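REQUEST
  id: r-88c1
  op: predict_structure
  target: Angiopoietin-related protein 4
  payload:
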Amino acid sequence: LPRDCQELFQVGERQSGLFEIQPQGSPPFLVNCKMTSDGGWTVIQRRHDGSVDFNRPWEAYKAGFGDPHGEFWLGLEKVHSITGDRNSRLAVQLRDWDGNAELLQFSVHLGGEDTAYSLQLTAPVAGQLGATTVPPSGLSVPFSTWDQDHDLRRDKNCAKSLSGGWWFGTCSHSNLNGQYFRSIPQRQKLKKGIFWKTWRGRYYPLQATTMLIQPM
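RESPONSE
  id: r-88c1
  status: 200
  body:
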């Protein structure tokens, strides 16, 4: 069995879809691979119609949930079995309600559960994401869900005030795992939506997202 999508690409697999892989120290599981000029990408998240509830607790974000032929979240322990401790490219694809698309890419490291699946960002990459003052040693941002939220403020639970699970560095940078919306609701619920502040705004609900990862 191939270790990951990139191994699949490297033996000549051309089609994007569902394939059986087995990383190190993992049981076999079925991934979504995307085959591109750039090689094999692992699809770790995909949203496009609001048919799958993303407002799930810690254990569901670890194991994964959703339809692998539709909207889904692959699962932090599956993603981390794929990346290991290797530097990885993370691709983030957004789509607004006018058909426009926005393609972003960041090199990251992803810790395991001992780190609560923290994203480890160098200072330049954290600068790319809008952090204006960061130590030269960078930034790690743990994953948070409503039942396991890492906002240090005794008053505030970021995941619980919004929706879904995410790397909430702040509570207003992004959340691609929020509540899916089609049109304008009555502000206090748009807070809880699918958003990426620096593209269409804090309160603009995205039509579609994909996240993909690829080691190195």
